[PDB]
Write a protein that binds this DNA or RNA. Sequence first.
RNA 1: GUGGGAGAGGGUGGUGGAAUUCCCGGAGUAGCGGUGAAAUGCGCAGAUACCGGGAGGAACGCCGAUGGCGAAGGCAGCCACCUGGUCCACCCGUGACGCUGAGGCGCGAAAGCGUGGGGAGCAAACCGGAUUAGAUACCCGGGUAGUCCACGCCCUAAACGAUGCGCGCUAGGUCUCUGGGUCUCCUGGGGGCCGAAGCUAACGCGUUAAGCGCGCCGCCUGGGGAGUACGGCCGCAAGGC
Lengths: 119, 101, 88, 73
Amino acid sequence: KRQVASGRAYIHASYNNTIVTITDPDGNPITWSSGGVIGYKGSRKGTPYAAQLAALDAAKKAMAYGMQSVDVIVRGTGAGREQAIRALQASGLQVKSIVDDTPVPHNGCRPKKKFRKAS
Amino acid sequence: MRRYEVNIVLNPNLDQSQLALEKEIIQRALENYGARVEKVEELGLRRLAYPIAKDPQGYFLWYQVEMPEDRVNDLARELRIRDNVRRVMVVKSQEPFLANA
Amino acid sequence: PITKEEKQKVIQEFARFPGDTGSTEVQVALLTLRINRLSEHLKVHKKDHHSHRGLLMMVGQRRRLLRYLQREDPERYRALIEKLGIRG
Amino acid sequence: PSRKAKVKATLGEFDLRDYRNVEVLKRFLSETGKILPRRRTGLSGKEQRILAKTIKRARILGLLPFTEKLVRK
RNA sequence: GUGGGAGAGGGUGGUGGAAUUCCCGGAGUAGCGGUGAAAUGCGCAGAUACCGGGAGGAACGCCGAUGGCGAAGGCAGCCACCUGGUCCACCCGUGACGCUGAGGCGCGAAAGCGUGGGGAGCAAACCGGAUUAGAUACCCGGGUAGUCCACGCCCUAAACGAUGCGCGCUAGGUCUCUGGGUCUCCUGGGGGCCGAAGCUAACGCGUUAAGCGCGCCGCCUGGGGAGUACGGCCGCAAGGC
Ligand SMILES: [Mg+2]
Ligand SMILES: [Mg+2]
Ligand SMILES: [Mg+2]
Ligand SMILES: [Mg+2]
Ligand SMILES: [Mg+2]
Ligand SMILES: [Mg+2]
Ligand SMILES: [Mg+2]
Ligand SMILES: [Mg+2]
Ligand SMILES: [Mg+2]
Ligand SMILES: [Mg+2]
Ligand SMILES: [Mg+2]
Ligand SMILES: [Mg+2]
Ligand SMILES: [Mg+2]
Ligand SMILES: [Mg+2]
């Protein structure tokens, strides 16, 4: 309820899950889906299919707000980042663009062991 | 004393009044620290690659004084105190190194 | 740093004659300059060891030239010292 | 990869120490605010090394980016 | 000496942006997280994902490597100041002023210790979840000392090229970093690789010697007992020699 028309879609991929957020041009979230949301719990939560479903859910739910066009923005390398970007294109929602905004420090905090071993 | 190219980037939303005031202080300073201004250039407003102090632009002042090393840091130290002054890069001079020539 | 000029006034004040640069005095002179500078610096930057070794060497080379001096002309030597500030 | 055109050939004589020449420096930056390699900048060890120091100053002054966002994916 | 060159060489001050955590606001809702699966755990006192503002600590992406600097340990955001070594050219000055070096003195990764400060992330111990025949572990969630700064101490190491320092002599090819030149390549300093002769148990080394020689230092003399005991010296201690 607000008629946002043109928005912004955030795809936060990761090896464990893919959560999708749809916000307004200012960036304030309108709706959001995810592995959990869609029904998958635990492991399959992050498969690419879950991604698909989650992606679609975000659209549909955001469709009511009158959403029609949107700029996709990606983050994470997780398995499932792509499907999301796909579904989000075949949801009617006109995908204005796609971007990689995965953050990366210029070497900052000692990563968790599982992420070090880099030397 | 040595040749130091001075750089300054101050608030882009300054009225001529407020502006001249700051430049006045840049001299007040530069002079106060044995700085003979061999030259200057004022490119003014420039679109910054990234916002500085929330502002999407900045007014640039480029000089080139000659002053006592024992100062410079103090110079810039002082030169920074100002609020409208957002950045000061006192790099030292160096004859150009052409390339692809 | 030590200015080219600064440095020259040293060679003058020590050279055995016009055009003399590498005489065993001028050198002992030049070194005393670098030493008093470094010594100074390190008085303030106590943790700057890498520099200190440079000094430990400088003081070394000097002590070595002066040695040679006191063996080939105990005068120029006994003369250089009093002229500088080495000894007590 | 790398086989594009050498970011140096397609350019004239220029002061590699000019840290305000955004209009030229920018060319040495990647699709992102990342400094290009020599296989792309076509420069030499010494050149590439002086560039780096330059592009880094440009970044502090605010004329050049530290990073940009990738488009299309 | 004079003129030139490169560099993450050291010390002090200042400073930049990315990311993480936390706090503040906004928008938003049921999950997030994590794994081989899970669970502990976090979330309706509204977490996760998203935007804005702030605080703070520690580290510096790309450049960047077959790279560089240092005597070693080791050293990379950027700026200034302070300061060490080193290379080439000129052949200008001194005139064997040299080499090595028992003791001595200094430096010396990490951990660790003392006092004060700081503490974002990480993380011995520890508190939990899981795996297991058990699991005082590997995997997961937490977490204190510590990791950071200052001053003082400790003095170890696969502190490695497992190769002490200096000098002279003995085919070349090729790649590279930095200087000079008549700048198709020559000549010097450094880093690699393939190789003459030669050496070597072999592997390999081979103008960056492990070759041919000279000087000086250090060190070895079967394994276990043992880097232990005693003594001595050093240390606040741990403990070192
Ligand atoms: Mg001569
Ligand atoms: Mg003579
Ligand atoms: Mg130590
Ligand atoms: Mg420590
Ligand atoms: Mg302590
Ligand atoms: Mg943790
Ligand atoms: Mg743990
Ligand atoms: Mg060589
Ligand atoms: Mg060579
Ligand atoms: Mg043979
Ligand atoms: Mg070989
Ligand atoms: Mg025995
Ligand atoms: Mg022991
Ligand atoms: Mg005792």
